[PDB]
Structure formats: structure tokens, C-alpha cells
């Protein structure tokens, strides 16, 4: 049995990711694969307990690669792992895994690294996220939106609206970026909401500012977001404040799935 030999990004793709802070690869996973991932997402939303977040409809579920065999395999996929290694220039592990159901009918502006630095003791922004598109992403179903090049600043200041971690994944975020700071970033660099078909992968930098608007449209915008971190960049578990299913503590380097008879 055989897996396709590992594909990595071209030098122009790597340049684009480094310059913009994001990159889309279209049609990484096929329809049948996506539908497997959608079924498992639905299982996780149904049975995830305290790892589910909520009007009261599912907003997200966290940590599923620790609890689902299917998602545990996904993060080792040869479509994903080799690019994560290549971009981070290290062995890698999963810092965070989440499925953000942007149901058919806000995430405020933020840099992920800001969260992971302060909540989890991530020492440098040497991490990224791969967002797998379970639905077509269009202009109308609340696409992730970025300030391109906005990661080159580094961490940007934000008020800490909370003395807990409950508000880290609510509509009102613990470390939101203010209107004055964003207006500046946006006037300088612009805003971009990358689009793509079901099965695409959107890669984005831990430090890139991003947001998404409410989805009142008729279509869902399900994303599976896998955050890969450099093993060298492992979080300081002594500054960590969160459960495992938000901030991993097993730093074992990931290895790629091989083709087996089962």
C-alpha cells in the first residue's frame, strides 16, 4: 500500500506565507474525506462535554485530536505534517485543535500568539495554524479575515478583559485589539479574507491579526483548525493556566501516517 510522497510548499509559496502571514492550498482533501471529517466533527460537538463552547448553538469544540482517533490521525496526515515541519523548520506537535462551526444564521480581532504567550507560556511565535475548509468559504459566510503582513510587528498590545480563561474562546475575547490600533493596521496594510472550496487548507501565522464577522447567510462555514508548534518552541508548562484540551503538554514530535492494511 502507498501514500503519495510528501509534498512541501514551493519556494514562492513559502515566500508568500512569510510575506502575508497566510496561504491557501485548494482541494487538499477530497469530498469523501471531508465528509468523514464533518461526521466526526458532528460527533465531537455531540459528545464533547466541557470541551464544547456555545443563543446556545455550538460555537466550537476543543482538543478533539486527543479524544478522536480520526482527528488524532488527521494531525499526522502527509498532507499536513510535512508542510508544518517545513514552515516551522523543526519537528512539530499540536499545541491546540479546534473546530469553529460558524453556523449559518463574531470573532473580534486578535493574534493567537498573544493568547498562547500569556495563557500558555509559548515563548516565541514559532507556530502556525492550518484551517481545513469543511464548507466552501465565500465572501458571505463569515470568512477568516487577516491584515496581511500584520505579523511582522510582533505581539501588539490588547486589554485583558477577564481574570480567567473562560473568555479566551467567547464572542468577547480576553485580548481583543482596539479600534485605534486596528484602524492604523488596516489603513497601512489592508484586510484580506482568503476564499476557497471545500477541502482547502488555509495556513496562517501565530502572530497574524485576524477576525471573522457574524454569519447570518444561509451556509455554514465549518473550519477544523490545527495549531502546530515547533518542538523547540514547546510552551512552558510552569506558566500554563489551561487544560490539556486547550494547551497541549505532550511535546512528542509528530510522525507521519503510513499506509497500512487497516
Query: For ligand [O], which residue of 53, 129, 215, 233 counts as binding (CB under 6 A)?
Result: 129
Per-residue DSSP letter, 51: G
Applying CB under 6 A, the site for ligand [O] has a residue count of: 4
Q: How far is the CB of 220 from ligand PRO (least distance, A)?
A: 19
104 binds ligand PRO (CB under 6 A): no
Binds ligand AKG (CB under 6 A): choice among 9, 14, 42, 155: 42
Segment interacting with ligand AKG, rule: CB under 6 A, options 37-45, 68-76, 154-162, 229-237: 37-45
Query: Residue 167 and residue 107: Cα distance in Å, rounded?
Result: 12
Beta strand residue intervals within the chain, DSSP E: 22-25, 52-53, 60-62, 92-100, 107-110, 127-133, 145-146, 159-160, 175-176, 201-205, 210-212, 223-230
Residue 215 among known ligand-binding residues: no
Q: 221 labelled as ligand-binding?
A: yes
Task: Locate all alpha helices (DSSP H) within 103-220, ordered by sequence.
Answer: 112-120, 179-189
H helix intervals, 21-111:
31-47, 69-74, 81-88
Using alpha carbons, list the distances in angstroms from residue 6 to 15, 30, 84, 132, 227: 20, 17, 12, 18, 20
Among 17, 22, 29, 45, indicate the residue that binds ligand AKG (CB under 6 A).
Answer: 45
> Of its own copies, ligand AKG, ligand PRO, none, which one does residue 135 interact with (CB within 5 to 8 Å by kind)?
ligand AKG
Q: Dig out the grid coordinates for 48 from the structure.
A: 464533547
Report residue 87 as a C-alpha cell: 514552515
169 binding ligand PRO? (CB under 6 A) = yes
Site residues (vs ligand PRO, CB under 6 A): 96, 110, 112, 115-116, 168-169
Site residues (vs ligand AKG, CB under 6 A): 38, 41-42, 45, 99, 101, 134-135, 220, 222
The binding site for Fe(3+) comprises 110, 112, 210
The binding site comprises 98, 100, 102, 110, 112, 168, 210, 212, 221
Amino acid at each position: 500500500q502507498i501514500m503519495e510522497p510528501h509534498d512541501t510548499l514551493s519556494p514562492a509559496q513559502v515566500d508568500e506565507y512569510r510575506k502575508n502571514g497566510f496561504l491557501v492550498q485548494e482541494h487538499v482533501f477530497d469530498e469523501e474525506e471531508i465528509e468523514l471529517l464533518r461526521a466526526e466533527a458532528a460527533q465531537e460537538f455531540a459528545s464533547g462535554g466541557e470541551r464544547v463552547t456555545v443563543t446556545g448553538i455550538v460555537r466550537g469544540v476543543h482538543g478533539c485530536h486527543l479524544y478522536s482517533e480520526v482527528f488524532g490521525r488527521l494531525v499526522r496526515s502527509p498532507r499536513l505534517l510535512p508542510i508544518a515541519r517545513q514552515l516551522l523548520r523543526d519537528d512539530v506537535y499540536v499545541h491546540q485543535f479546534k473546530i469553529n462551526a460558524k453556523r449559518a444564521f463574531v470573532w473580534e480581532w486578535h493574534q493567537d500568539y498573544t493568547f498562547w504567550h500569556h495563557e500558555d507560556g509559548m515563548p516565541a511565535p514559532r507556530a502556525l495554524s492550518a484551517a481545513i475548509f469543511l464548507d466552501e468559504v465565500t465572501e458571505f459566510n463569515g470568512p477568516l479575515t487577516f491584515v496581511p503582513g500584520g505579523h511582522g510587528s510582533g505581539m501588539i498590545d490588547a486589554d485583558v478583559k477577564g481574570e480567567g480563561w473562560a473568555n479566551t474562546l467567547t464572542a468577547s475575547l480576553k485580548y481583543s485589539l482596539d479600534v485605534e490600533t486596528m484602524r492604523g493596521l488596516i489603513e497601512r496594510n489592508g484586510m484580506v479574507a482568503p476564499k476557497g472550496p471545500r477541502g482547502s487548507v488555509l495556513w496562517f501565522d501565530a502572530n497574524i491579526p485576524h477576525s471573522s464577522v457574524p454569519n447570518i447567510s444561509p451556509f455554514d462555514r465549518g473550519l477544523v483548525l490545527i495549531t502546530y508548534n515547533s518542538v523547540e518552541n514547546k510552551t512552558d508548562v510552569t506558566r500554563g493556566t489551561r487544560p490539556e484540551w486547550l494547551a497541549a503538554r505532550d511535546f512528542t514530535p509528530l510522525t507521519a501516517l503510513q499506509a497500512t492494511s487497516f
